Tab-separated table of C-alpha atoms in Angstrom:
chain	number	residue	atom	x	y	z
A	1	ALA	CA	0.028	0.055	-0.299
A	2	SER	CA	3.158	2.200	0.459
A	3	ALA	CA	4.849	1.635	-2.658
A	4	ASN	CA	1.361	2.219	-4.263
A	5	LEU	CA	1.340	5.478	-2.589
A	6	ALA	CA	4.817	6.659	-3.851
A	7	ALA	CA	3.784	5.065	-7.219
A	8	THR	CA	1.193	7.258	-7.666
A	9	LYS	CA	3.459	10.249	-6.325
A	10	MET	CA	6.027	9.630	-8.551
A	11	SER	CA	3.770	10.132	-11.876
A	12	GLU	CA	1.546	13.184	-10.077
A	13	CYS	CA	3.623	14.911	-8.178
A	14	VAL	CA	7.155	14.346	-9.929
A	15	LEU	CA	6.601	13.752	-13.808
A	16	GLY	CA	3.798	15.954	-13.266
A	17	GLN	CA	2.235	18.757	-11.787
A	18	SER	CA	-0.566	18.659	-9.056
A	19	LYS	CA	-3.662	20.741	-8.241
A	20	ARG	CA	-5.128	18.453	-5.529
A	21	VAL	CA	-4.453	19.210	-2.000
A	22	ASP	CA	-2.484	17.615	0.348
A	23	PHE	CA	-1.115	14.669	-1.782
A	24	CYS	CA	2.522	16.147	-3.184
A	25	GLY	CA	2.757	18.967	0.055
A	26	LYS	CA	1.015	21.489	1.891
A	27	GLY	CA	0.676	24.847	-0.482
A	28	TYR	CA	0.093	24.595	-4.130
A	29	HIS	CA	2.210	22.154	-6.041
A	30	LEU	CA	5.277	23.383	-8.095
A	31	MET	CA	7.907	20.382	-8.630
A	32	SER	CA	8.872	17.285	-7.240
A	33	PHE	CA	12.753	16.047	-6.731
A	34	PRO	CA	12.773	12.484	-5.881
A	35	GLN	CA	15.952	11.345	-3.533
A	36	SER	CA	16.918	7.309	-3.280
A	37	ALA	CA	16.704	6.385	0.423
A	38	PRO	CA	16.881	2.546	1.562
A	39	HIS	CA	14.588	0.261	0.751
A	40	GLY	CA	12.478	3.652	-0.031
A	41	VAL	CA	12.165	7.164	-1.851
A	42	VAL	CA	12.359	10.402	-0.329
A	43	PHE	CA	10.663	13.342	-1.483
A	44	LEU	CA	11.279	16.813	-1.959
A	45	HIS	CA	8.199	18.880	-2.658
A	46	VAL	CA	8.489	22.474	-3.291
A	47	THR	CA	5.476	24.252	-2.928
A	48	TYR	CA	3.733	28.323	-3.469
A	49	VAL	CA	2.817	29.423	0.558
A	50	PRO	CA	1.396	32.709	0.803
A	51	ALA	CA	2.597	34.309	4.066
A	52	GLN	CA	1.696	38.280	4.528
A	53	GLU	CA	-1.693	39.129	3.599
A	54	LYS	CA	-3.428	42.957	4.203
A	55	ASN	CA	-7.474	43.643	4.609
A	56	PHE	CA	-9.343	45.558	1.579
A	57	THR	CA	-12.793	46.743	0.608
A	58	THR	CA	-14.084	44.351	-1.607
A	59	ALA	CA	-17.491	44.760	-3.743
A	60	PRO	CA	-19.337	42.113	-6.127
A	61	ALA	CA	-19.602	44.689	-9.355
A	62	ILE	CA	-19.159	47.687	-10.740
A	63	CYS	CA	-21.514	49.666	-12.477
A	64	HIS	CA	-20.479	52.233	-14.728
A	65	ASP	CA	-22.746	52.589	-18.441
A	66	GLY	CA	-25.591	51.225	-16.411
A	67	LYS	CA	-24.999	47.419	-16.406
A	68	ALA	CA	-23.654	45.234	-13.707
A	69	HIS	CA	-19.730	45.000	-14.062
A	70	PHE	CA	-17.850	41.816	-13.162
A	71	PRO	CA	-14.414	41.011	-13.238
A	72	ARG	CA	-12.949	38.347	-16.279
A	73	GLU	CA	-10.245	37.803	-13.656
A	74	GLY	CA	-9.193	38.272	-10.133
A	75	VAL	CA	-11.167	40.618	-7.673
A	76	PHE	CA	-12.344	43.877	-6.955
A	77	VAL	CA	-10.178	45.543	-4.378
A	78	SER	CA	-10.090	48.798	-2.533
A	79	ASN	CA	-7.424	50.392	-0.175
A	80	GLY	CA	-9.827	53.507	0.026
A	81	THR	CA	-9.153	55.725	-2.623
A	82	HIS	CA	-9.797	53.913	-6.284
A	83	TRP	CA	-10.668	50.729	-6.852
A	84	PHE	CA	-8.679	47.910	-8.540
A	85	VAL	CA	-8.138	44.497	-10.266
A	86	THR	CA	-6.074	42.333	-8.321
A	87	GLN	CA	-5.813	38.395	-8.342
A	88	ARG	CA	-6.645	36.252	-5.679
A	89	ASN	CA	-3.035	34.636	-4.914
A	90	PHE	CA	-1.138	37.968	-4.983
A	91	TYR	CA	-1.628	41.946	-4.944
A	92	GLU	CA	-1.059	43.326	-8.124
A	93	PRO	CA	-2.951	46.733	-8.684
A	94	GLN	CA	-5.009	47.210	-11.810
A	95	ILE	CA	-6.752	49.847	-13.585
A	96	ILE	CA	-10.369	48.801	-14.569
A	97	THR	CA	-10.867	48.915	-17.611
A	98	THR	CA	-13.339	47.045	-19.953
A	99	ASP	CA	-11.107	44.577	-20.869
A	100	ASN	CA	-10.851	43.503	-17.387
A	101	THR	CA	-14.498	43.287	-16.625
A	102	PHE	CA	-18.062	41.902	-18.700
A	103	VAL	CA	-20.940	43.594	-18.778
A	104	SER	CA	-23.787	41.098	-18.098
A	105	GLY	CA	-27.554	41.799	-16.714
A	106	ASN	CA	-28.227	45.524	-14.702
A	107	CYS	CA	-27.050	47.242	-12.003
A	108	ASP	CA	-29.949	46.764	-9.881
A	109	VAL	CA	-29.683	42.771	-9.280
A	110	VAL	CA	-26.562	42.463	-7.628
A	111	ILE	CA	-26.568	43.239	-4.193
A	112	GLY	CA	-24.178	45.247	-2.674
A	113	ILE	CA	-22.810	46.753	-6.096
A	114	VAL	CA	-20.719	49.869	-6.239
A	115	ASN	CA	-20.381	52.852	-8.537
A	116	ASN	CA	-17.692	53.725	-10.165
A	117	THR	CA	-15.870	54.586	-13.741
A	118	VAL	CA	-14.592	51.987	-15.869
A	119	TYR	CA	-11.907	52.928	-18.035
A	120	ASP	CA	-12.218	52.576	-22.275
A	121	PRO	CA	-9.375	52.543	-23.973
A	122	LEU	CA	-11.039	53.252	-26.903
A	123	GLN	CA	-12.329	56.982	-25.578
A	124	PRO	CA	-7.929	58.516	-25.261
A	125	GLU	CA	-7.650	56.942	-28.704
A	126	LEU	CA	-10.162	59.771	-30.051
A	127	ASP	CA	-7.989	62.804	-29.556
A	128	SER	CA	-5.168	60.969	-32.310
B	1	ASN	CA	-6.364	7.022	12.084
B	2	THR	CA	-7.899	9.948	13.739
B	3	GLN	CA	-5.288	12.045	13.710
B	4	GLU	CA	-4.835	11.301	9.617
B	5	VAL	CA	-8.397	12.443	9.212
B	6	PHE	CA	-10.564	14.231	11.742
B	7	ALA	CA	-7.267	16.840	12.337
B	8	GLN	CA	-6.000	18.393	9.608
B	9	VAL	CA	-5.613	21.759	10.797
B	10	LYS	CA	-3.523	23.035	13.548
B	11	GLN	CA	-5.432	25.617	14.949
B	12	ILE	CA	-9.275	26.194	15.396
B	13	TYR	CA	-11.726	28.072	13.433
B	14	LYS	CA	-14.466	29.605	14.913
B	15	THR	CA	-17.824	31.364	13.507
B	16	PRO	CA	-18.578	35.479	13.922
B	17	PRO	CA	-20.858	36.078	16.286
B	18	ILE	CA	-22.988	38.001	13.930
B	19	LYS	CA	-24.675	35.324	11.289
B	20	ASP	CA	-24.991	36.645	7.866
B	21	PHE	CA	-24.064	34.691	5.091
B	22	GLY	CA	-26.095	35.818	2.240
B	23	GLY	CA	-28.791	34.087	3.124
B	24	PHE	CA	-27.971	30.536	3.876
B	25	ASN	CA	-28.325	28.849	7.080
B	26	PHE	CA	-25.969	26.568	8.629
B	27	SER	CA	-27.231	26.435	11.855
B	28	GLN	CA	-27.867	22.279	11.147
B	29	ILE	CA	-24.329	21.846	10.716
B	30	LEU	CA	-22.675	23.633	12.846
B	31	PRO	CA	-22.367	23.194	16.481
B	32	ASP	CA	-25.338	24.294	19.114
B	33	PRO	CA	-23.595	26.134	21.837
B	34	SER	CA	-26.596	25.389	23.905
B	35	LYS	CA	-26.074	21.894	24.044
B	36	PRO	CA	-24.159	20.646	27.084
B	37	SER	CA	-21.456	18.419	24.864
B	38	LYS	CA	-20.511	20.196	21.713
B	39	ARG	CA	-21.964	19.115	18.473
B	40	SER	CA	-23.871	20.182	15.663
B	41	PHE	CA	-27.800	19.052	15.131
B	42	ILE	CA	-26.905	16.624	12.318
B	43	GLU	CA	-24.009	15.169	14.876
B	44	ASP	CA	-26.990	15.227	17.251
B	45	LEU	CA	-28.425	12.316	15.239
B	46	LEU	CA	-25.678	11.239	13.607
B	47	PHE	CA	-24.644	10.298	17.712
B	48	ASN	CA	-28.227	8.516	18.279
B	49	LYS	CA	-28.431	6.365	15.289
B	50	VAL	CA	-25.117	4.675	15.802
B	51	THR	CA	-24.661	2.633	19.171
B	52	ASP	CA	-21.836	-1.390	31.047
B	53	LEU	CA	-20.453	-3.926	28.059
B	54	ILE	CA	-17.334	-2.882	27.640
B	55	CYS	CA	-16.518	-3.191	31.844
B	56	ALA	CA	-18.187	-7.056	31.738
B	57	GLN	CA	-15.700	-7.569	28.998
B	58	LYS	CA	-12.447	-5.719	30.564
B	59	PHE	CA	-13.984	-8.105	33.533
B	60	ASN	CA	-14.025	-11.117	31.420
B	61	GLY	CA	-10.627	-10.371	30.602
B	62	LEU	CA	-10.832	-8.943	27.220
B	63	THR	CA	-9.505	-5.198	28.268
B	64	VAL	CA	-11.548	-2.353	26.215
B	65	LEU	CA	-9.129	0.455	25.797
B	66	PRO	CA	-10.116	4.008	25.556
B	67	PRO	CA	-9.380	6.241	22.658
B	68	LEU	CA	-6.777	8.708	23.339
B	69	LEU	CA	-8.911	11.377	20.784
B	70	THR	CA	-12.471	11.711	22.517
B	71	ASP	CA	-15.572	12.390	20.816
B	72	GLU	CA	-15.728	15.906	22.085
B	73	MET	CA	-12.039	16.799	20.559
B	74	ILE	CA	-13.218	15.228	17.356
B	75	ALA	CA	-16.429	17.802	17.228
B	76	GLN	CA	-14.126	21.026	17.736
B	77	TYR	CA	-12.083	19.521	15.186
B	78	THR	CA	-15.514	19.312	13.243
B	79	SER	CA	-16.474	22.482	13.761
B	80	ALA	CA	-13.025	23.735	13.369
B	81	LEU	CA	-12.912	22.898	9.584
B	82	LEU	CA	-16.437	24.192	9.401
B	83	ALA	CA	-16.080	27.679	10.474
B	84	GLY	CA	-13.008	27.765	8.155
B	85	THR	CA	-14.748	26.533	5.199
B	86	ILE	CA	-17.093	28.970	5.886
B	87	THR	CA	-15.295	31.544	6.761
B	88	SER	CA	-11.886	30.975	5.371
B	89	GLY	CA	-13.157	29.124	1.826
B	90	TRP	CA	-10.379	27.193	0.478
B	91	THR	CA	-7.723	29.414	1.539
B	92	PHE	CA	-7.090	27.581	4.785
B	93	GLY	CA	-5.172	24.484	3.633
B	94	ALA	CA	-3.467	26.089	1.077
B	95	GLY	CA	-2.070	28.689	3.633
B	96	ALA	CA	-2.932	31.858	5.794
B	97	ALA	CA	-6.416	32.459	6.206
B	98	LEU	CA	-7.539	34.949	4.487
B	99	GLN	CA	-10.662	36.793	4.658
B	100	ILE	CA	-13.457	35.906	1.924
B	101	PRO	CA	-17.173	36.513	2.087
B	102	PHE	CA	-19.156	33.229	1.298
B	103	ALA	CA	-20.551	34.587	-1.569
B	104	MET	CA	-17.749	35.206	-3.185
B	105	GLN	CA	-16.146	32.067	-2.457
B	106	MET	CA	-18.781	30.136	-4.143
B	107	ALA	CA	-17.997	32.678	-7.234
B	108	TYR	CA	-14.894	31.231	-7.173
B	109	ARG	CA	-15.894	27.925	-7.064
B	110	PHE	CA	-18.266	28.280	-9.690
B	111	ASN	CA	-15.719	29.392	-11.749
B	112	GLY	CA	-13.456	26.404	-11.658
B	113	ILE	CA	-16.435	23.625	-12.727
B	114	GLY	CA	-17.267	26.269	-16.289
B	115	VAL	CA	-20.218	28.142	-14.791
B	116	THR	CA	-19.990	31.934	-15.388
B	117	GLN	CA	-19.526	34.002	-11.495
B	118	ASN	CA	-22.766	35.763	-13.056
B	119	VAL	CA	-24.787	32.909	-12.193
B	120	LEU	CA	-24.406	32.943	-8.307
B	121	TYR	CA	-24.388	36.814	-8.455
B	122	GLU	CA	-27.995	37.459	-10.181
B	123	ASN	CA	-29.256	33.995	-9.131
B	124	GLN	CA	-28.314	33.911	-5.245
B	125	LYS	CA	-31.612	34.198	-3.995
B	126	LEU	CA	-32.606	30.940	-5.968
C	1	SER	CA	12.325	21.884	39.406
C	2	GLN	CA	10.995	20.079	36.836
C	3	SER	CA	9.162	16.463	36.663
C	4	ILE	CA	6.092	14.702	34.531
C	5	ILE	CA	2.828	16.753	34.471
C	6	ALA	CA	-0.581	15.796	33.410
C	7	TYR	CA	-2.903	18.321	30.904
C	8	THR	CA	-5.367	18.034	28.973
C	9	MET	CA	-4.583	17.692	25.200
C	10	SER	CA	-4.288	21.248	23.279
C	11	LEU	CA	-6.455	21.155	20.313
C	12	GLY	CA	-4.372	23.844	18.519
C	13	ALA	CA	-3.543	27.800	18.602
C	14	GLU	CA	-6.566	30.287	18.200
C	15	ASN	CA	-7.199	32.038	15.841
C	16	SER	CA	-10.568	34.246	15.252
C	17	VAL	CA	-10.698	34.964	11.746
C	18	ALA	CA	-12.861	37.868	10.938
C	19	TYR	CA	-15.799	38.003	8.280
C	20	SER	CA	-17.438	40.333	6.724
C	21	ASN	CA	-19.200	41.371	3.416
C	22	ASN	CA	-17.193	43.790	2.058
C	23	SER	CA	-13.491	42.737	4.048
C	24	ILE	CA	-11.133	40.582	1.607
C	25	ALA	CA	-7.292	39.750	2.189
C	26	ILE	CA	-5.460	39.903	-1.036
C	27	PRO	CA	-1.593	38.313	-0.194
C	28	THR	CA	1.305	41.030	0.096
C	29	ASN	CA	4.272	38.373	-0.232
C	30	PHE	CA	4.711	34.808	-0.692
C	31	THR	CA	6.710	32.177	0.756
C	32	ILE	CA	8.333	28.993	-1.358
C	33	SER	CA	9.040	26.299	0.845
C	34	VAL	CA	10.530	23.196	0.496
C	35	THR	CA	8.388	19.882	2.370
C	36	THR	CA	10.160	16.619	3.090
C	37	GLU	CA	8.482	12.976	2.571
C	38	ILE	CA	9.662	9.789	3.210
C	39	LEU	CA	7.670	6.392	2.303
C	40	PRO	CA	8.830	2.529	2.712
D	1	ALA	CA	-7.796	1.915	4.243
D	2	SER	CA	-11.215	3.150	5.046
D	3	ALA	CA	-9.264	6.136	7.100
D	4	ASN	CA	-6.920	6.729	3.911
D	5	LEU	CA	-10.005	7.093	1.794
D	6	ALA	CA	-11.381	9.606	4.611
D	7	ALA	CA	-8.267	11.784	4.280
D	8	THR	CA	-7.674	12.060	1.311
D	9	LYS	CA	-11.976	13.389	0.431
D	10	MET	CA	-11.336	15.468	3.815
D	11	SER	CA	-8.372	16.757	1.735
D	12	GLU	CA	-9.776	17.474	-1.528
D	13	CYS	CA	-13.091	17.541	-1.138
D	14	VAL	CA	-13.765	19.925	2.426
D	15	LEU	CA	-10.398	21.774	2.676
D	16	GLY	CA	-9.546	22.391	-1.133
D	17	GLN	CA	-11.992	22.009	-4.781
D	18	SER	CA	-11.525	18.967	-6.980
D	19	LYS	CA	-12.514	18.345	-10.054
D	20	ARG	CA	-12.285	14.523	-10.098
D	21	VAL	CA	-15.053	13.110	-11.074
D	22	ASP	CA	-17.429	11.412	-8.918
D	23	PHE	CA	-15.044	11.307	-5.904
D	24	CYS	CA	-16.674	13.996	-4.100
D	25	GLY	CA	-20.457	12.794	-4.874
D	26	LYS	CA	-22.036	12.960	-8.175
D	27	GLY	CA	-21.736	16.266	-10.345
D	28	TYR	CA	-19.449	19.116	-10.296
D	29	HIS	CA	-17.735	19.298	-6.279
D	30	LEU	CA	-18.439	22.772	-4.967
D	31	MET	CA	-17.992	22.745	-1.165
D	32	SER	CA	-18.163	19.655	1.100
D	33	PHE	CA	-18.905	20.117	5.351
D	34	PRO	CA	-17.109	17.265	7.242
D	35	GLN	CA	-19.611	15.824	10.357
D	36	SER	CA	-18.491	13.671	13.377
D	37	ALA	CA	-20.061	10.482	13.503
D	38	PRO	CA	-19.064	7.643	15.781
D	39	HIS	CA	-15.471	5.812	15.087
D	40	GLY	CA	-15.611	7.612	11.413
D	41	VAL	CA	-16.653	10.581	9.881
D	42	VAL	CA	-19.550	11.775	7.679
D	43	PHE	CA	-19.210	14.365	4.580
D	44	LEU	CA	-21.662	16.637	3.354
D	45	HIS	CA	-20.882	16.792	-0.384
D	46	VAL	CA	-22.602	19.944	-2.395
D	47	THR	CA	-22.538	19.551	-5.910
D	48	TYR	CA	-23.373	21.164	-9.017
């Protein structure tokens, strides 16, 4: 039974990359390096574990043109000044724009929707 | 078997004092502090449906050893896992616990299965 | 002045995670760790 | 053997979210809520 457990880890952890939890070890699995041991095998699992975080203000959707804007990737966050688009795994400020959002439904549906201005890259191009 | 199964975490997670999850009732699955021994309403039934005898066998020459982990402590592990799943979502097992609203947690759970997040925000009532 | 003592098993450190609708936490830092696992 | 299966489901179905087919129960797995039971454990699997 223990040998079969190691066999699966050789294929899932070492050879490939595993998205399952608590198999290749705590945290996201990146790469596994096998090591020889007497009558057995040892695994060195390199994982990605987040450490420090900071509490921010979030909203389910943004309202600009009258229709609810939803994130295409990431979540909506604010430090108290402007609303940014950031990934769940890390904080990477990004300006809210039509390319990062998608129009669906109306602003009267989402509960807790916030109003803001979604940046449109075609507007400033009119000056060119 | 109990160490490798019941307790997956080294920390104790608790639910907030004010319960608003967005219209979801977890009261049945969560432990009720009013009970003398901490358990949920589901665990209350699980304990009654599954069944001194061990003392008579102890004197008959067959010793029944008490488990290292008590049933009350098992209920605390579950409550911690329930509090984490609800409050911390999926982030407590992958690293430092992150605060997320449960409404947005399902939004990530739907995006993973191929369901657009808009379904939740619009239909969350149903 | 050390000896054997009997105590109740600790269930782990107490951690109370705040919960709110508009509150979210985005990791500002990360750490890559190496875990050692041995199997026969 | 059954205890190891409970440990696998606990991590994948409860702690995390697994895309495995019919491992966490019929349908697309969303979240799992564990429950204590005598000499075992009970899993409530929310599926789509």
